Symmetry: D2
Subunit: 392 residues, 4 copies
């Protein structure tokens, strides 16, 4: 198929621009020019581009240079019609952030980290971005006694409250998306899963402005069900953005093309986002790919991988719809009682008093007979998969 | 050392009573009489005993039988002075619960699950229990299309609000603690980590009556840092109860004696719980051991293992105390700047306007010089381990 | 549709699993063995396997035992099903709580061998060609409780005996050690396919020993199952295979083959079928060692049995199409997959000739070579598209 | 308390020399001078140093430079009395090795990789090294269809056979140690575990010259039991060298100080290596630390961390000795029948026929009665932990 701007496929500058310098080796590709990136991505079907401050403007650029880069960058967007849906700040590369940005043990680093974000918020606001993604990659520890978690959560909250204050007062209208990750680069990162991140956000001053940006690989690094966590995120209404990529369970973060890691879970994820209630998608934000072209590839492999992300999503979408439209699947869903879960356990107006009065819910309930009936889940799964294989 | 009632060590009837029938074999031990279990626990220094409805009263016992059991039980409690600080319900054993209790796709099972719990709340309230633990072991799925998570969270919530209501109205004064687990027995369980449970609890009708009951091995099954997750639970003030045991990373749940799995994390956990703010413990509920005596042991090994849990806790407590009273450790803490995290990042009355005006926070900040100072974390970790090893 | 040439087999204990798990009672009633034979024959299975204790209840008197066997043989006869492999339950009974062959208790070890000898005679009687040995209770929960070195000596001692016996009696059995990292023990001896092959190389008649790797068992450690099978085939030790599905490191799920890591299920079928000639690289039984989920009744059980065969045949078809695609041939050429098969050295070349080749070092432009891409993502993308029936 | 040359502690130049440039950030430490490294290690008690060709001589140095560096290095060893027990080659950093050295799909890379190694073998021999470690970090793949494993193993073997031929012909008397690793940097690496590396070695032309160099964290990345793995390597007599470090389960390779990851396994490991048959160690090679001083530390932190490894090993040794020497432990071992595993299952000269005729081994065997006796394993384990904690 073909991507449309209505699909809202976005990519970070750092994705197709990853030079492939890994933990054990030198870069295998030369640097990617941002203007070219804009052009190349516009060409493959992306509707937007994102970036960290330092991806666009080299750390420690004088004003003139910085200004110079932005102006050229805006031209390219202009020309191509791409937007900047989200912006983020690099609080992990420079040595000063070795112990964190917002929660560094060092107070001077914390103050600096906030200044650095404020400045990116301004550029973001100016480019029309709606979301500020916050990935606290250096927030965490290698040793338990080196970090007071409670104090760290206080300092994290303290920084977020300020950013919300600023944005509201300047009238930027940003939404903030906290990105959880279990480890890498710290032995243990704070807010390790989608869950911890949502619980945290609920403790902020203007919780309505905060959500999460879960990434496929991050949850899989802990062997969690990505689709299920996204389902919980949507239940809470905190899915402000999403990072799509592939991973092969608990190991270093691979950042593969979306659907190149856990294919079955990539399938159910697309089904959840698109086969939303009232026909429509359950999620309307950017479908952002935060992946990395393998170290073994050249610039051609890079564009190939960029396109593979889009094809994977559209092929899966196509099969999720067919699946839902299949009468045999409909019959299987019925036998599995999937929809009976949507009917309240209690009859309208019933409370514990009436439930207690219902002998059929306990005293006269035949648990044994109910326990003998199967749910037909295997058959239902077999049909989903045959839809995925294009075997139906 | 010796355990005192002030230590608040409690054990589940199902721990020392596990007959050791595992997934691949038959029981290796005969059943333990509840009265006998009360006497033996009292003798090793436990202050309380806990149980699932079905551990005490065999599933489907007539009222005369049940009444007889309860009465004999109360006598033992009376005679020994042990208390029942928490009670729980078995919503996982009987075949009727194969697709869950509160979230089974089948409506009638959902209604029966609630009645089974209400009945247990009554007995709990009569025994003086203050906490009702909820472990939704069957709430989840093996296949993504078999369960509507959103509908499931709705149903979960629907059941829990009723329980709070009933408890409120009857004046039971119970606190509810949801126990997260990532998998086992379902392929994926709903509310997989302490984070997900906390975020969920925040959405109930009366969040104040709800917290979590996190278990050491459950978080380690996902290879998460248990101590750090507890630290976050404490920050939210949602640590209502705790299950202590041992585990060796991501694999089936082993339920070893506390400290026999990740020893270093057990050590930092005891430090966190007992060396709380203001001299005193950061947590005051029961120190509950939800473990299983290894299948290779006989009743002698069973009491040995019951005693090993307490010994382990007391030995680590002793070492945690010594660790903190060491002037050298104190000096390392100061050099690592642990306490400096506790100081707000912003000066009193400082806002973004003032922060933006501080050139020392950015314009004149020497990132490069700060980035070069070491935190001394390794040295601090080494002193901690030397304390644990009794080498200091 | 399955044919006897596909060689699909199932263990009696897979479809017959009552779904009594670590936390709940059984949700299904017992399956009758004759019935299992008839139902499996019906879905296209060519063979059935069993642990001694799955067919003949532990402790049956000879009359009883004899009665059951005669019944079973008759069902085989009628349906035309064979018994390619047999195994022994050395894990259920309490006596085996510390192991069969490597129990600390000498008397259990002796008994463990007697139990297996007995099953060997029955296997021989039924025409089985492979004896699978799953040492599920061999290992430990605590490091000081088990002397690993003495354990391997005792594991070896027991196997050498079994081989002697088989060889003296003319049974012609092949022995396949089944590795598992854990469950039921905290740590099981011979935890991966690699550990088991290395061990087998140390027995008295190594040619008689190989392995029986299980998809889920390697995945429990997060290992690449296909890649381990490739190494097993290279050593020529793939004597049998147990297929099922798993979702990484967690308890063993025993899902239907292909319901866990689908990409790896695809590369595995490609490996086993798109062998050397045009021919399969593996000629043994495709054994499904799985469990129908606890949420299912007997209709679910038969559906899950068929799902295993369906997944393999669907994967096979896509594997074949993948290889026949000219676009794939082109990507394989760009990726230099086949260049790996050409020896690094030219015929008759040794270290002296290599050392004299200035072009292999002194004049080698590493920077230039390091800049060319392998085109692996593109190759991967064509593979997935074949899998999805998108081409 | 103090290290002796008899302890055989070695460190790789790349360990203390790691500048802390990780996957997400820039180096936080300056480069370490090889000569200085030699003096500092000599000073902390190390008996030897190891290096990758490229750690000592910058990739692409002319012979004049190369030669000068070697001469200075040689001097330092001279003055300090340190030896070079092992050398290794870097076949992972340079972009040319992106698909492997010996198993690169590119034939020219394979020829080049062999040449690089032959050269390092020459330097090794000149410095007196006895072991050549081969870590095939880039041998493997991210995608299944990209690598023919069979062909790969043929090419790995082809290369290794030539290396043995050469050493043997030049009379170097080297031993070759293959270092297994499951992943990082490739998605999956060939010879992922100690078991796979041993099986492979058995297929070489002169297998007696080959063994493995297992690393603590490498086996732990797969959640395997490192001690049990070493036990198997010792049974085969293939433990040619060993890399000690710490790791926290399946996640990126942390390379912490030895014993700072799984402490309990670090303990059983020292016990295995040191309490060998008849008092003597079961292993006689170097106790090599292949770790990295955390990114948060400075050079002070670096030397501290170097010493921490030595300390950890000697503290554990000390407790392993005391554990074994304790008559209570000796009694628990007897009760658990640990040594009974050493007695052959079969009586002297007993074969299948005598065993088949022994009614006590089957017909008259009381399995139910034996099945009920406990093994006393929890208690033995508790005794071990108490010795570790310095409580006994
Ligand atoms: O693990 C790295 C993160 O995924 C990163 O790319 C963020 O999303 C942006 O800072
Ligand atoms: O994994 C089992 C659970 O931990 C259970 O013991 C709960 O704590 C109470 O049902
Ligand atoms: O994990 C269980 C094993 O796979 C078992 O079924 C063997 O294959 C036969 O005992
Ligand atoms: O994972 C990195 C390896 O441990 C490496 O240090 C080798 O031992 C030497 O090439
Ligand atoms: Mg991301
Ligand atoms: Mg529990
Ligand atoms: Mg099997
Ligand atoms: Mg190493």
């Amino acid at each position: 198929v073909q991507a449309t701007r209505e699909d809202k496929f976005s990519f970070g500058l750092w994705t197709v621009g990853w030079q492939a310098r890994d933990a054990f080796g030198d870069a295998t590709r030369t640097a990617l020019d941002p203007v070219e990136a804009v052009h190349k991505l516009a060409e493959i079907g992306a509707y937007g581009i994102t970036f960290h401050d330092d991806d666009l403007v080299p750390f420690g650029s004088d004003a003139q240079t910085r200004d110079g880069i932005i102006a050229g960058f805006k031209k390219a967007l202009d020309e191509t019609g791409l937007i900047v849906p989200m912006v983020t700040t690099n609080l992990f590369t420079h040595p000063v952030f070795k112990d964190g940005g917002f929660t560094s043990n060092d107070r001077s680093v914390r103050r600096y980290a906030i200044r650095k974000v404020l400045r990116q918020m301004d550029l973001g606001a100016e480019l029309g971005a709606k979301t500020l993604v916050l990935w606290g990659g250096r927030e965490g520890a290698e040793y338990d006694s080196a970090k007071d978690v409670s104090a760290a959560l206080d300092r994290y909250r303290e920084a977020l409250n300020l950013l919300a204050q600023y944005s509201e007062d300047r009238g930027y209208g940003l939404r903030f998306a906290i990105e959880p990750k279990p480890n890498q680069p710290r032995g243990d990162i704070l807010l390790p899963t989608a869950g911890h991140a949502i619980a945290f956000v609920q403790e902020l001053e203007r919780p309505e402005l905060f959500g999460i940006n879960p990434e496929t690989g991050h949850e899989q690094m802990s062997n969690l069900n990505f689709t299920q966590g996204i389902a919980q995120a949507l239940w809470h209404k905190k899915l402000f953005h999403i990072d799509l990529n592939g991973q092969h369970g608990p190991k270093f973060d691979q950042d593969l093309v979306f659907g190149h890691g856990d294919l079955l879970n990539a399938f159910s994820l697309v089904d959840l986002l698109e086969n939303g209630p009232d026909g429509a998608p359950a999620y309307d934000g950017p479908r952002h790919f935060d992946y990395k072209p393998s170290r073994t590839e050249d610039y051609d492999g890079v564009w190939e991988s960029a396109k593979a992300n889009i094809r994977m999503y559209l092929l899966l979408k196509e099969r999720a719809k067919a699946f839902r439209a299949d009468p045999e699947v409909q019959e299987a869903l019925a036998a599995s009682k999937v929809a009976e879960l949507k009917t309240p356990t209690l009859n309208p107006g019933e409370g514990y008093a009436e439930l207690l009065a219902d002998r059929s819910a306990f005293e006269d309930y035949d648990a044994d007979a109910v326990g003998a009936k199967g749910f037909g889940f295997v058959k239902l799964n077999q049909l989903a998969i045959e839809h995925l294989l294009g075997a139906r």
